[PDB]
């Protein structure tokens, strides 16, 4: 399991005001790390949070969860990918405070347009299908804000499943510097 | 896996009267937010308890355990949605104490109709569907008190799902104020 | 996790301190045996305080149920009951059971009272045991209610044939609870 | 999880001499009945022992285990009944020290005949068949001595499932008293 | 779930009282628990008794074995007591145990027989099995001869076919020393 | 079980500095390796890290947040295979340390060319093959870089799975050198 | 349930200097004993290590893993086969210090040549059969080196599955002596 410093590993990086966002995202992992950003606000609102983030995406309103109480509390939260940052993933990415918004050489992000289902009445069906446009509406938005391209440059970049490097997330916008040795 | 600062966050996280509802409502994880309500109850009837609400709805009996605790108890109990707050999960936040119900920018809201089912003898099918329908009155009722509303405008908005953003909830009455930044 | 408290127990646990016990879910031998468990500890730390029994349940297995029942009067201080979100069943009884006038529940609850259910396969002289023992149970249980309620006995057996669901106010009237409670 | 009050409840009710047996009879469980018993003994072998039973019945073996650790200690170990107590319950409830095995009310008690099954060959059939029927034999001569009723009465009321009312289990051996407030 | 003494489980409890538990199905992973309680008994105190309750059907022949040549090899004597039962490698632990201290409670049940295994694949390497099975054979009767101080023709006759006793049985045969009743 | 020394085992040998990656990669055991270099590295930036390597391989992605955290941190992470270290095991075991790069005698480690697999509209397959076709690439300049070899030669000999005893590594530039007794 | 002495009881038995490997082989179980070795070392480099064995084999880079850190680290490791030590278990028997390698008297022990399979294309068979007999070589040379036997006789021992007795495994040189009592 995981070892212990009586800490875990992660508790004693905690303190550190790290977070880690690890693997698909979904209600339970995501509220954990809002209880974080929570916990480390009240701890100290000045100083900065970390949060590391290796994901693929996963659930739009469970990263709206977490997206909305980065911007929501007072200390300003870097972001930093390792390994990838996928869908929601990159959209925690991008969301981070700007100027600490940061990956590692040999990250892979990749944005994309919402995914979704639905079955039922056709009347239903155009509920939800009117839900979910609306979705990635209001979520190419907030990567437009945070990158600042346009919303239309958003919306037909991310058509079809777009892979980044460090250095093409940059130019984009996603992220703000591509670190390499402390 | 629940970190430790010895209370796990949510343990300390409790003690600054905050109680989370994730996920789907059903009887053991809603009689732990009654057990949460009672026991901030006793700690001090006075100081106000935060509820934040990220859940796709679930039982309405487990639900309004939820409820009625809510309103039982001398504390005031705030209700703010992060992520979504659908069905049971809508009437739990719109239940919160009068002026402070909240949601975040990109909280998504959902309300419509109860959902069952019965298999059976007719004699007992007819009891059943008297009884669902008698829950969709007493339920339109509780939202009409809350947000304001004429009783025949929820009965016609909850026939379908109804999705809705923070500022159309506020007009609703759903909420009451859309949080941004503290 | 059930979360924790300090002067260190869990939530359940520190509100055990104060009396209160929870039934909740599907009634089974082993989470029945908790409360009894719950009860008797009680009653030895203080056998004349209330004891605050809630209820969260659809019902489950008779014997199960029985063994709370059995206990609530055994022992000597009075156990409330409140029923939250839903009492059911086995749950409607163990409800009806509480201390006299301490039987509650709130605005919207739900309860639920109908004839047992039961199953059996085999041999048509072992059927003929079980159908007698099952017809056994449902005279007990009616008069478990008729009791407690106050309802004649053939009025219990006849409210009971099919599933008939109360309200507040109908459970009160029905002599099933004492008081709906609203605010503290 | 078992609620704690620093002992978990059921921790804190061993301290009283309280031991409970609940649900299908099967190895493990019947062994922490075991453990309790002789630990029980050794913290104090003339203090009653109380136990609770609320079982459907189960193995036999793991039963007998009980059974026998029952009469092997010093201590009285008395039996109460809540919720059921059939087949291999009711008996470990029989089994308990005279005058001390107890019901409430509202329990239900069922004595019957022992179950079981094989496969194979025929002469591991006769091996087998031989054994389940001395079991039950033996069985009927356990529930003989402490009921008082004579072997072809077991014998004859157990041949079927027969349930049994609080006040029905007194008449017949089974408990020795029906509790229903405390004293 | 495993109570607690105070802060002791229940097991660990007795084990401070050279107090052993062996149940259920023998397998590598409950066997290596019994030699690593017998090891750290031995290292306590070389010199005082150890007691092993055993209710259990029998198992792995491998695993048993660890079991019995670690209580063979250890300083202090092993005293067995069957509660329950005792069959298989229940039975061979049970009959291991230190000479004039070999117990069973009076409705424990024991059954000997032969080994039981399987093997599929080349007709060479069905030999190669079918060899080792019957040199297991032969060993384990060897010990039930040792033990019981039957012979060993005896012992391989009356294990061709599962062969159940009572404790006075199991007496008679060598199997055990004494049936206890009571303390 | 995992022993206790008030410490387990791991945590005992984690002050030590020494952690274990052991298994299949993957995004939560790979995030725990990451975990104790930043932690390691917070104790004592200057002394150095040993990481012993007992895996087939796995995720890409999970590695090279490995394979980029050991870079980036200012301790030189030794890497000791036991066992095995084959794909992206024996790539994390070439990224050791310079010099600091060891095996067992028995250790087996091979290197091959990424995996992967993806089903969809034949524009998405487009997208994907030249992702995993920059991935193999970027791989293999990682492994020509830590080894010394040419790139070419890493493209020829990763083409088929290519097993490697300890002295073969060695004399490839995969590891530094052969450990026998202490 | 591991009960507990505050050592639970095989936590006890390692300030002992005494471990257990119990069951099939396996990267994870392996990787505990390496760190059980590596521990007691650390405690005192001088003082043998005594472990036991219950064993039917298992993984041959797993088991690889625990005979090489049995080499390298200083103190000599003792082994005693208690029931069974068959396939990799033998060999770790067999590789214990010379002079210290025991059973009892009715352990079984059990050589063979290595088991494997693959499946995919005829290159690729030809890569993974040429590996197989690769390691079945070393894997006999290890028994060689600790039996004292020639090569080709374990190979041809080891051909298919041979038994051993306590008496027999002494004579091989698997084991050095019979331990009966005490």
New interface residues.
Partial sequence: ??????????????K?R?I?L??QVE??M???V???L??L??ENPEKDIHL?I??PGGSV??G??I???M????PNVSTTC???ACSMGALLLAGGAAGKRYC?????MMIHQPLGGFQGQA??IE??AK?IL??KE?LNQ?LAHHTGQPLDVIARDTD????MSGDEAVKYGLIDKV????
């Fill in positions: 399991l995981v070892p212990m410093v009586a800490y875990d590993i992660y508790s004693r990086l905690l550190e790290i880690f690890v693997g209600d339970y995501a509220n954990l809002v209880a974080q929570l916990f606000e009240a590391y290796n994901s309103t469970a709206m969860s997206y909305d109480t911007q929501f509390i007072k390792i390994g990838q590692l050489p040999h990250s892979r009347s239903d509920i939800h839900e609306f979705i209001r907030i079809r499943d777009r892979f670190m390499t040795q402390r």
